[PDB]
Structures are given as structure tokens and as C-alpha cells.
Amino acid sequence: GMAIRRLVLDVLKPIRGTSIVDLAERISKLDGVEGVNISVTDMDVETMGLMIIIEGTSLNFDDIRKMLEEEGCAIHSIDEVVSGNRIIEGK
Amino acid sequence: GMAIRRLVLDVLKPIRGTSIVDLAERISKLDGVEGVNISVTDMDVETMGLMIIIEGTSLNFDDIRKMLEEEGCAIHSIDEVVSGNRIIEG
Amino acid sequence: GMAIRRLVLDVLKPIRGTSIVDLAERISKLDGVEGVNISVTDMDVETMGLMIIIEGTSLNFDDIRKMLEEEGCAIHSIDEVVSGNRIIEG
Amino acid sequence: GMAIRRLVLDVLKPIRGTSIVDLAERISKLDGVEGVNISVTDMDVETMGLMIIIEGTSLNFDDIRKMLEEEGCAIHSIDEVVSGNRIIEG
Amino acid sequence: GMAIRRLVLDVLKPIRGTSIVDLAERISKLDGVEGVNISVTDMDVETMGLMIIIEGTSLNFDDIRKMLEEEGCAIHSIDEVVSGNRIIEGK
Amino acid sequence: GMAIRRLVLDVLKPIRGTSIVDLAERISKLDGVEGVNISVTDMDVETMGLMIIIEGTSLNFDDIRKMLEEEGCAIHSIDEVVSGNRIIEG
Amino acid sequence: GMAIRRLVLDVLKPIRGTSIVDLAERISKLDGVEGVNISVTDMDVETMGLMIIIEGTSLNFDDIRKMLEEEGCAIHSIDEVVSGNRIIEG
Amino acid sequence: AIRRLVLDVLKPIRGTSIVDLAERISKLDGVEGVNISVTDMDVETMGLMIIIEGTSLNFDDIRKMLEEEGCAIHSIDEVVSGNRIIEG
Amino acid sequence: AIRRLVLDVLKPIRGTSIVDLAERISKLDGVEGVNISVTDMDVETMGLMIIIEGTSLNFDDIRKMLEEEGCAIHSIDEVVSGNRIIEG
Amino acid sequence: GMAIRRLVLDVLKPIRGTSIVDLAERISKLDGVEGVNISVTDMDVETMGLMIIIEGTSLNFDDIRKMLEEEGCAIHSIDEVVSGNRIIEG
Amino acid sequence: GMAIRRLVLDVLKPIRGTSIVDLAERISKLDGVEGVNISVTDMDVETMGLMIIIEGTSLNFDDIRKMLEEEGCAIHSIDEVVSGNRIIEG
Amino acid sequence: GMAIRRLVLDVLKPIRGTSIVDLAERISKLDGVEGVNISVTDMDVETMGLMIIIEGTSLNFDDIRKMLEEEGCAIHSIDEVVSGNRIIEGK
Amino acid sequence: GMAIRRLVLDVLKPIRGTSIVDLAERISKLDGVEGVNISVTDMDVETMGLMIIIEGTSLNFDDIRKMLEEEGCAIHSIDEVVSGNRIIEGK
Amino acid sequence: GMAIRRLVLDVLKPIRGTSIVDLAERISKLDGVEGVNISVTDMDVETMGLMIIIEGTSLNFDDIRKMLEEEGCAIHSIDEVVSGNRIIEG
Amino acid sequence: GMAIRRLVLDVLKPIRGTSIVDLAERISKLDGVEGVNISVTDMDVETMGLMIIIEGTSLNFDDIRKMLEEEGCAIHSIDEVVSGNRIIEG
Amino acid sequence: GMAIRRLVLDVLKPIRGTSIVDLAERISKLDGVEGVNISVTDMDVETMGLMIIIEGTSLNFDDIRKMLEEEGCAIHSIDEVVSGNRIIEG
């Protein structure tokens, strides 16, 4: 049973601190993660709006959430999650 | 005899409780389910609007419905269902 | 001689009664039917607007129509039909 | 020599009489016809606007025209015809 | 040496006479012709505007023009012609 | 060393004289030419605006230019040229 | 272990100094880098706006950033980063 | 090294034709293809987009060659380097 | 239901030709294709491999038709049934 | 959850009784079965040697074995079985 | 209703008379014929052994047989015939 | 890090006991397993020779071995193992 | 109507005279010919055995035969001929 | 600069100690390694003959060798090595 | 017109003199040549047996033959030649 | 002008000295080299038989030969060379 396969997260980060490169790298080292895509959607003066797409096998959301908090991020919204044996897409 | 293959559900959930991650995982473990996609369509102060797409083979709607109720969800609408030997599109 | 291959029906159903899941399942069990897609296009207070796409080989329209009536549905419009040895698209 | 391969017809039909399902079936039984797609483009109070796409090999237009007349249809326009060894697009 | 491969013709035809079905069939029987596509682009009260696409190998334009005249058609414009060993598409 | 592979020419021709069909055929017979596409871009009362695309291997521009002059054509503009071991797009 | 696979950088460079050709070449010689694409997005009188796309395996961002500074460039924005065993697109 | 160069180039409206120019660039070591297209033109100068692809393209030679043929590089719009061509 | 039937069939060396036989089988409901090939022949009988493919093939009709045409089924060598054709 | 996907069985059947056509049809109607291929490998005077390939989703082997016994068949050997989310070949 | 699609004929022809090239051309011009392949399998002193493969749509065997007789050929054997909506291989 | 991806096992089983169907099913339910192929290579009077191919992500060999022992099987040989981010094949 | 598309000829040629390169070139220049493949199958002391494969559209066999005779060749056998709108392959 | 891409090693290991599963896992976790295939080629009473195929990017042979020694293995032979920008075959 | 496209030559060369590398390079620089493959088939004490495959467009056989002679080679046999608009195989 | 594209060398090396891994790495760093494959074909007590396949663009054989000599290798035979705009196979 392959559990969580894709997470699409709308994430807020302070405009500086952990760069998104270092952030992408750390997430990619978690167990089950096969790929991470972080892209900037917008930014204020002090905060950065990020879309973080994580794909893999039995992704541990708790760990991912823990890592984002530690790096000063907040999850504003879980926009999409895909779970199971194969990836299903949205309408 | 492959019965139900795809369900597209418009679902209401309390803004907190069972996270949609845990909800997606649980549904994906049901017999016949090959994939689940949960995405947030909108949210009020206290409720979350979700589109839940389930695909598989002979999906048991009663079980899925039972599971969603237990997790505090309501089905507002069954938007699409596909049944039979292969997946037909709209 | 493969007769009818695709029917696209604009159908009216009472907002409750036979759920569209049970409806899709029955239709999918008819002879020649290889797939059914039912999706909700709109809904009033008391009626549901459905697009029912049926694909298969020598689909029997009389049976399908008979089944829809029995389940409380009306065919407002046959929007598309495909017949013959292969599917041609519009 | 394969002659006529595709006909795209803009057709007028009375809103009731021969249903387009029966019409699609009868056309699909003609010699050389490999598929028919009939779709409703629009409709008045008393007439139905149809796009009839016929594909096959050495399609006999006279027979098809004869059949449409007999079923109460008029050809408003032959929008596209394809002829020869292979299908060229427009 | 394969010569003319595609002709795209803008053709005028009287609204009745030879139907475009019979016209397509005749053209398709010419030597070297592998396919014909006739589609109606517009029509007045008495004339029909047609786009005739002919593809094949060493298509004889003289024969095709002769046939169109005999069937009451006029070539308003030769919009595209392709010649040689293989088809080049326009820009 | 494959030299010129593609020429895109903006060409002026008298509205009558050598038809563009004969012109396309004559160019296609040159050494190294693999295909010619002539299309009309516009036309005045007495002159025709043509886009001539020639593709091949070691195309001889001098010959092509010579041939166009002899057939009453003028090159208004060489819009694109591609040279070398393979075709690069714009 | 595989780390950073793609970096898309929005970069500022003085309108003259290290040419973007020499800059692309220098970056392409770094360990893990398999390809660099530098394109000009816009330019003022004294500064050049560049989009630098770097792809490879375990790309070292610190090295890349150091190199850009040394060549008189500034990173305005890291627009996209991809990390892990395989390339996930946006 | 260099796989793709996209150059914005100025050339006098006459002199070396862009056909001869494309041919001579295509004969350089490592060059696999050249595409020259006219983007615009004044009364006395021609605006050209020159796309060169190949393997370990020598920019100095290409630049040297263009100068010798009376051309100026207004702008290097895109360069691609490394083991594969990465797209923009 | 039945998607593919492979039949080992005996036919008298003359009577209904295998061309007419192939045509009449191909006109049955659900049949999409027939392939008849001669495997061997005695002085008075012909050995045929008849491959029929389609959707919900009616074996009784096919069997009935073959008998009527003077044929005997020596052996049903392969049958495929269900939503897809599974190969051997 | 998905279970048995392919069974390849070496089966003995009496040379007459249930024809292999009726046998293939019966098996193809079981839950989860998407296709059956029965082919004759050899035959004695009184017994028929069959290779039965069944494919589907969560195939119930107990049901299949029960059905074969009832039809007078014996399983000589289970030559191959495939289980899980996807088909692994040998 | 597409009828005969492929004929494979074992044919005897006198070693000279109508060449097999002219014979192949003449057969290819029949209605419904899309391709002919004639190949020599063997030859005596006075007769030629030919395998003639004809493919198309609603091939008229009577015409083909008539044409072969007129050209001095005999059909020794019809080795394969394919009929219906699509081509099945042996 | 996706660890063990493919195991090819040469396995001995008593000619009766747990059928290979039930055996394939149980293995396929283990965490990370995406597919199992069991095929009979040969058989004596009392023992069955099996090739068991397991594919997945971070396959736990200890668990698989434990399950085979419990079902009365012995691993005669681990013929092939594939580990890492992608499947590499043998020469 | 595309007529003859492929000719496979078993041809005898004197071991010297017109080289097979010049012979292939000439044939390839005939109307309708899109390709020629000449390969040596065997050779005696004074004669060369050739398989000549010609493909195209409405190939003129008379012209091809005439050309071979003029170049000192004999057609021992026409092994295969394909005619019509599309290529059928042999069995 | 991609350095070593493929190593094919003929390796000797004691019949017991570190299992080849654990060995494969450990090697797969090294920097640059994308895949490992270990297969048994033969075995004596006390030693195991292994073919270890490692693929990746800038594989560090010293580390791999160090790891194999630590796990009780000996490299009998480096049978094949591939280095550079892409994988070349034998 | 594209003339000669492929030459396959069986060539004899003295075991030393012009190395086959230099020979391959010089042939590849001829007009129309797009690729050369020289491989050793066998060798005596004093002579080398080579298969030279040349591909391109309007290959000049006289030049190639001239070049081979100058480099001390003899053409034992022209095994295959391909000519025309496209490459036919044997 | 792409010159040499592939070299296949039969090479002799002392059983120890420069390992074939270090040898493959050096060669892969030469200008124009895109890939190297070194595999052991056989070995005596004191010498190793190697097949070295080098691919790239305008490979400099003199440099490669110079490098092999310096590393204690001898070229026994150049088995295959490919030159020109593309790789042609034997």
C-alpha cells in the first residue's frame, strides 16, 4: 500500500532565512520522497509565497510539516493531495 | 463485471479534525481503490470545501460514504460517476 | 454489424430517488455496454440535470430508455449518437 | 479505387419522427459505411439542426441522400467531402 | 522525380450543378491523386466558395484545371502548391 | 559539408506568365532540392506576392535566383536561410 | 543521493563586463552541471536582466551564487528549484 | 562548452549576403547548423537573428568572422552550454 | 462474453468455398473479423483453421452456421473471453 | 488493495463435457476477472490438456478452483501467479 | 459490412504471356483493391508458381478469378481469406 | 533514498501446503511491494522449485524471508537484487 | 491510382562494364522512382549476380527493363512485385 | 564533468556475513549512485561469486572499494567502466 | 535529385600506411558525405580487410574510388549501393 | 566539420599500473570526448586485453594514442572508426 504520493502545498516563508534551494534539498532527502519542486508564486516586502510540490511513495506529511515549521515556514493551505497505487489528477 | 470505476465527490469537512492527508490515505486503502485525489476548492471560517476524486475497480460507494461520515465529512454532491469495463470521459 | 456505439443523453432526474451511482451501475450491466459516464450539469430544488455518456457495441436504446424511465428519469435530448464499425468523432 | 471516404453534412430534421439514433443506425448499415456520428448543433420549436459525419469506403452519396429524404431530412449543406486512397484534412 | 504533391485551390462553383461530392470523386480518380478534400468556405445566392485540397504524386494541374472548368468551376486563386520529393509545409 | 538547407524567399511575380505550379515544379527539379512550397501572400492588379520555401541539401542559390529571374520573378527579400549539417528552426 | 537538479534564477548583471557567453561556459564547468541556458529578459542603460536555467545532479548552489557575485551578477530571485531523484515539474 | 548561441546582429543592407554569411558560419568547427532570419531593416542596416547550434562552438571565431564580414553583435540574447541543450 | 475463437474445422474439399464461408461468418452480430486458412487437405476433405474475433460472439450461431455449411468442428483450439483479449 | 492479477494454470479436462468455450465464458463472469484465454496444449483419447490464463484484479483463486472442479477439470499445475499493484513479468 | 479484406492465392501461370508486373497492375485497378503483392515461389520449364496477396475492402473474388483466367492463370489454392470489419492475422 | 527495488529469489517449497497463489498474495500485501511474480521452474516428488520476483520501494528483505519461512519455504539462493533510485539490469 | 510500387529483380551483369553504382544512379533518375537498392548476391569469373530493389510510384517496368539490357544486364527473375495504393508485404 | 557512470565488478564475498541485500542497499546510498544490481554468478562452499553493477554520476571508486572491503568483499576484477557525459555500451 | 545515398565497400588495404582513422576522416570531408564507418573484417600478415560504409547525398563514387587508390586501397567489391530520394533496404 | 565520432580500440595493458577506471576517466576529459567504455576481454598473467570504445565529436586520435602510451598501453588494433556529421553503424 503506497499511501501518500503527491502533496501540493501553498506555503508562506519569510523573505529571507533558509533559502528555498536549501529547503528543497532537505525535503528531497526525506524517506520516500522522489522529487520536490518549489516555485515562487508571489512576494510581499517580508514574506514569500511558495508552491511546494512533493512526489514520492508513502510520504510522511507530519515530517514534512515539522521540517517546514523548523525552517520558519507556515502551511497556509494543502491545495492537493494524491494517495494510493497510482497518481490520479484533478479536474 | 467491473462496476464503479470513478467517483467525483463535492465534500464538506470541518476546517479541522481529520486532515485531508490522513483522509486521502484512509480512502486509498479501501478494496478496489487505485488512487485518490483530494483538493481544496474553497473554505469558510469553520468548513472546508473539497473535491474528492476516487478511481479504481468495483469501488464500494457505501464504504466510502461510511468512511467520510466517520471522519466528519458530508457529501454535498456526487458530481460524476463512471461504471463498467473501461473509463469513459465527459 | 456493430450498430450503436455511443449515446450522449441530456437527462432529467428527481433530486432524490435512485442515486446516480446506482443508475450508472445498472446501465453498465446492460448487454453491449462497455462504459457509462454520468455527470451532473446542473440542479434545481427538485430536479437534477445529467449528461449520461454510454459507450459500447450494439447498444440497445430501447432498453436504456426503458431503464431510465423506470428509475424516474426523462431524456430531454439525445445530443450525440455514434454507430457502426468504429467510433467517429464530431 | 476507394472513392468517397468522408461526408460532413449539415442536416435539417423535424423535431420528431425518426429519432437520430434510428437514423444513425440505418446509415451505418449502408455498404461501405464504417462509422456515423450524428450530433445536434441547434433546434427551433419544430426543426432540429444536425451535423452528420459519415466515414467509410466508396460511400454512395445518392443512397445516403435518398435515405435522409425518406426519413424526413433535408441536406442544407455539404460542408466537407473527402475522396481517394487516403484521408486529407482541411 | 515526384513533381507536384499538393495543390490548395480557392474555387468558385455555381450553387447547383455538379455536387461537390461528384466533383471530389472525379478528381480523386485522376492519375497520381491520392486524396481530395473539398470544403465549403462560404456561399452567395448563386455561387459557392470552395477550398479544394489535392494531394498525390506528379499531380497534373492542367488536367485538374480542365476538369474544374468543365464542371462549371473557376479557380479564383492557387493559395498553395507543394512540389518535389517530400512535402514541405508553409509558414 | 551540407551548406544551404533552407531558403525562405519573399518573391514578386507578374500576375500572369509562368504559373506558380510550373514554377514550383521547375525549382523542385534542381540538384539538391528536396521540396518546394509556394504560397500566395497577397496580390495587386498586376503583381503577385509569393512566399517560396525551398528545402534540400547544398542548395545552389545562384541557380535558384537565376531560375526565378528567367520566369519573370523578383526576390524582394530573403527572409530566412538555414545552413549546415542539420536544420535549425527560427 | 542526488540533491538539486534544476535552478531557475532571475539575475542582474552590468550591461558590460563578463559576457553572458563566458558566464554560461564558467557555470557549465561546475561539478554536477549538465547544462546552462542564459537568456536576456530585458535591459536598462547600465544593467542586464537575465534568466539563468541550470540543470544537473547535486548542483552546489553556494558555488553557483559565489560565481555569479564574482562575475558582477546579483540574484534578484530564485524562481524555481527542483530537488531529488527525479525532475518534478510545476 | 557552447551548444547554442542566439545573436542579435546588425549588418549593412548590402555587402555579404546573409546566404553567404550563413554558409561560412556553418563551415566552422563544431557548428552543426545556422539559422539567419531578418527581424527588421532600416534604409542602410539590416537587423538579423543568428541562431548557431553545435558542439564546443568557438565564440571568438564566430565574433571574429562576423566583424570581418562587416557585422556587429548588438546583443547575445541566449547562450546554452554543457552536456545537453537546455531550453528556455 | 466471447472475444476470440480459434477453431480446427473439417470441410468437404468442395461445396461452399472458404471465401463464401468467411464472408457469411463475418456478417454475424458481434463479429469484427474472420481468418480462414487451409492447414492441410486429403482427397475429399479440407483441414481449416478458422479464427473469429469480435464482441460477445455467439458460438451457437457460429456452430449452427458451420454445420449448415457442411462443416464439422474437430477442435476448439483457443477461446478468449472478457473485457480484453488476453494472449497465449 | 489489489491482490491476484494473473493466474496461468495447467489444467486437465475430460475430452467431452463442458466445452472450453462455455468454460471460458463462466470464468470470465467471475468478480475481478478481466480476461480469460483457454488454449489446448495436447489431448489423449479421453482427456484434454489446457492452459488457462486468467487476468484481472483481486482474482479469487478459491472460486476459480471450485468452478474448474465442478466442470470436471483438474489443476495439474499453477505455472505462474502475479500479485499486487502492477504486473511483474518473468 | 466490409466483406473480403485479404486473399492469399496460390496461382499457376504459363512461364510467359502476361508478365506478373502487368498482372499486378491490372488487379490493383479493381474496385476495393488497395494493394497487390505477387511473388514467384517456384517455376518449371513451362509454368510459373505464384503467391498473389490481395488486400482491400469488399474485394470481389469473382472479378479477380475472372481476371486471372483471362490472363492465362489458374488458382491452384486459396490459402487464406480474411473477411469483416478488420484484418485478423493467421 | 529508495533502497531495495527488486529481489529475484530461487526458492524451495514443499509440493503442497501454502499454494503459490496464497503465497504471492501475502507477499504482495507487504509494505513497499508493488508486484510479485511467482513461477514454477521445476518440481521433484515432494518439493517445488520457484522463482519469486518481487518489485517495489524499500522492500524489507527480513520480512519477506520471515514470511517464506513461516509458509514452509527455504531460500536456496538470492539470484539478483536491485537497489536505489532506479532499476539497473544485469549483463 | 498509383500502379507499381516495388520491384525486386534477380539480375545478371557482366563482372565489368557499367559499375553497379552508375547503374543504381541511372535507375534512380527514372520517373516515379523514389529509391533503388542494388546488392551483390554472388559472382562467377565473368558474371555478377545482383538483387535490384526499386521502390516508387507508377514505376514503368518497360523503361527499367530497357535500361538494364542497355547496360548489359539480364533479368533472370522478377522475384516480387507490389502494385496499388499502398505497399503489401509478402509472406 | 560527469566522471564515472558505470562500474561492473567481479566480486568475491564470504558465503555468509553481510547479506548481498544489505550490501546492495549500502552501496545505493553513496553519493552519485543511482542504481546497484548484485547477482550471484557462482558459489563454492565458503565463498560467493558476485557481479556488482553500479550506475550513477561521478561514482567514487575509492569509496565503493572501501565499502566492499569493510563488508568482507574482494574485487577480483573490474570488468567494465564507463566514464563521461553519457553512457557508452560495449 | 539526390543520387547516391549509401555505398558499402569491401576494401583491401596494406596492413600499414594510411591508418583507417585518417582514411575515415578524409572520406568524411568529401562533398555530400554525411558519415563513414570503417571496420576491420579480417587481416593477413600484409593486408587488411575492411568494410567501408559511406552515407550521404549525391555521393561521388569516382572521387571516393580515387581517394581509396591514392591511400593504397583496392575495392574488392561494391557489396551494396543505394540511390534516390530515400533509403531502401535489401 | 565533426571529424571523428567513434573509435573502437583493441588495447593491451599491463595487469597492474594505471587502473582502467583512472584510464577511462582521463580519456573522458579530452576535448570532444562524450563517452568512454572500457571492458576487459581477456587477461594473461601479466597483461590485460581491453576493448576501449570512445565516442564524441572531432576526437583527436593522436592525443588518445599519446595518452594510452603514457599509461603503459599499446593499441593492438583499431577495430572500428566512425567519422562525419552522424554516426553510421556497421
Residues 6+ apart with CB under 8 A from G42: G49
Residues 6+ apart with CB under 8 A from P11: P49, P50, P51, P52, P68, P73, P74, P75, P76
Experimental technique of record: X-ray
| F82 contacts H33? CB cut-off 8 A | yes
Q: Tell whether the torsion through CA atoms of B61, B67, B70 and B76 is positive or negative.
A: negative
Number of residues written out for chain I: 88
Instruction: Give residue for cell 530537488.
Output: G83
Residues 6+ apart with CB under 8 A from F26: F67, F71
Query: Rounded distance, CA J38 to CA J50, Å?
Result: 7
Numbered residues of chain I with Cβ closer than 8 Å to any chain K Cβ: 17-19, 22-23, 25-27, 31-38, 49, 51, 53
Query: Rounded distance, CA J41 to CA O21, Å?
Result: 57
Cα angle: G50, vertex G51, G56; to 5 degrees: 135
| M86 contacts D2? CB cut-off 8 A | no
Q: Which residues of M touch K39 (CB under 8 A)?
A: 8, 79-81, 90
Query: Rounded distance, CA O38 to CA O21, Å?
Result: 8
DSSP structural state of residue B58: S
Report the b/e string of B63-85 with b at 16+ CB within 10 A: ebbebbeebebebeebbbbbbbb
Residues 6+ apart with CB under 8 A from E35: D82, D83, D84, D85, D86, D87, D88, E28, E54, E55, E56
Q: Label the pairing between strands C33-43 and C47-56.
A: antiparallel
| Chain P residue with minimum CA distance to F84 | P1
Chains that touch K (3 or more CB pairs under 8 A): C, D, I, M
Chain H: nearest CA to F6, how far in angstroms? 9
Q: Tell whether the torsion through CA atoms of N27, N33, N35 and N39 is positive or negative.
A: negative
Report the b/e string of D17-29 with b at 16+ CB within 10 A: eebbbebbbbbbe
Residues 6+ apart with CB under 8 A from G2: A28, G57, G58, G83, G84, G85, L85, N34
DSSP state letters, L31-49: TTEEEEEEEEEEE-SSEEE
CB atoms near residue E31 (< 10 Å) = 14
Q: Using CB atoms, pick whichever of I6, I75, I84 lies closest to residue J34.
A: I84
Report the b/e string of H1-30 with b at 16+ CB within 10 A: bbbbbbbbbbbeeeeeebbebbbbbbebbb
CB atoms near residue N45 (< 10 Å) = 5
Chain N: nearest CA to H83, how far in angstroms? 6
| H55 contacts P31? CB cut-off 8 A | no
Q: M35 pairs with which residues across the strands? A: M55, O84
Residue type, C29: K
Query: Rounded distance, CA M69 to CA M55, Å?
Result: 19
| O58 contacts F2? CB cut-off 8 A | no
**Resolution of the deposited coordinates, in angstroms?**
2.7
Query: Rounded distance, CA K61 to CA K30, Å?
Result: 11
Tell me how far apart the terminal alpha carbons of chain M are, to the nearest angstrom: 24
Query: Rounded distance, CA H68 to CA H62, Å?
Result: 10
Residues 6+ apart with CB under 8 A from G62: none
Query: Rounded distance, CA E4 to CA F65, Å?
Result: 21
| N19 contacts L84? CB cut-off 8 A | no
CA I65 remoteness from chain centre: 10
SS (H, E, C) N39-54: EEEEECCCEEEEEEEE
Residues 6+ apart with CB under 8 A from H38: F77, F78, F79, F80, H18, H46, H47, H48
C-alpha cell at M27: 535507375
- List phi, psi (to 5°) of E67: -65, -40
**CATH number for domain E1-87, candidates 3.40.50.300, 3.20.20.70, 3.30.70.1340, 3.30.1490.20:** 3.30.70.1340
| L61 contacts N21? CB cut-off 8 A | yes
Chains N and G touch (3+ CB pairs under 8 A): yes
The DSSP H or E segment spanning A22 is: helix A20-28
Chain C: nearest CA to D36, how far in angstroms? 5
Helices I59-68 and I18-26 pack at an angle, to 10 degrees, of 150
Residue pair M51/M38 in contact by the 8 Å Cβ criterion: yes
CB atoms near residue G28 (< 10 Å) = 23
Residue pair D79/D9 in contact by the 8 Å Cβ criterion: yes
Chain K: nearest CA to C2, how far in angstroms? 9
Q: Which residues of G touch A27 (CB under 8 A)?
A: 83
Tell me how far apart the terminal alpha carbons of chain P are, to the nearest angstrom: 21
Q: Using CB atoms, pick whichever of D2, D31, D58 lies closest to residue K1.
A: D31
Query: Rounded distance, CA A75 to CA A9, Å?
Result: 7
Query: Rounded distance, CA F83 to CA F57, Å?
Result: 9
Radius of gyration for the alpha carbons in chain I, expressed in angstroms and rounded? 13
| O19 contacts P83? CB cut-off 8 A | no
The DSSP H or E segment spanning A33 is: strand A33-43
Chains O and D touch (3+ CB pairs under 8 A): no
Residues 6+ apart with CB under 8 A from C1: C58, D29, I27, I28, I29, I30, I31, K1
Residue type, N25: E
Task: Identify which of O59, O61, O58, O51 has the alpha carbon closest to the alpha carbon of residue O24.
Answer: O51
Task: Identify which of N56, N11, N2, N1 has the alpha carbon closest to the alpha carbon of residue N29.
Answer: N56
Query: Rounded distance, CA C71 to CA A74, Å?
Result: 50
Chains H and G touch (3+ CB pairs under 8 A): yes
Query: Rounded distance, CA J82 to CA M54, Å?
Result: 49
Fold that domain H1-85 belongs to in CATH: Alpha-Beta Plaits (3.30.70)
Residue pair A79/B24 in contact by the 8 Å Cβ criterion: no
Instruction: Give residue for cell 568524411.
Output: O28
| O2 contacts E1? CB cut-off 8 A | no
Q: Where are the domains of chain M?
A: 1-87
SS (H, E, C) chain H: CEEEEEEEEEEECCCCCHHHHHHHHHCCCCEEEEEEEEEEECCCEEEEEEEEEECCCCHHHHHHHHHHCCCEEEEEEEEEEECCCCCC
| Chain O residue with minimum CA distance to F86 | O34
Residue type, C60: N
| Chain A residue with minimum CA distance to B90 | A91
Q: Using CB atoms, pick whichever of F61, F77, F86 lies closest to residue H33.
A: F86
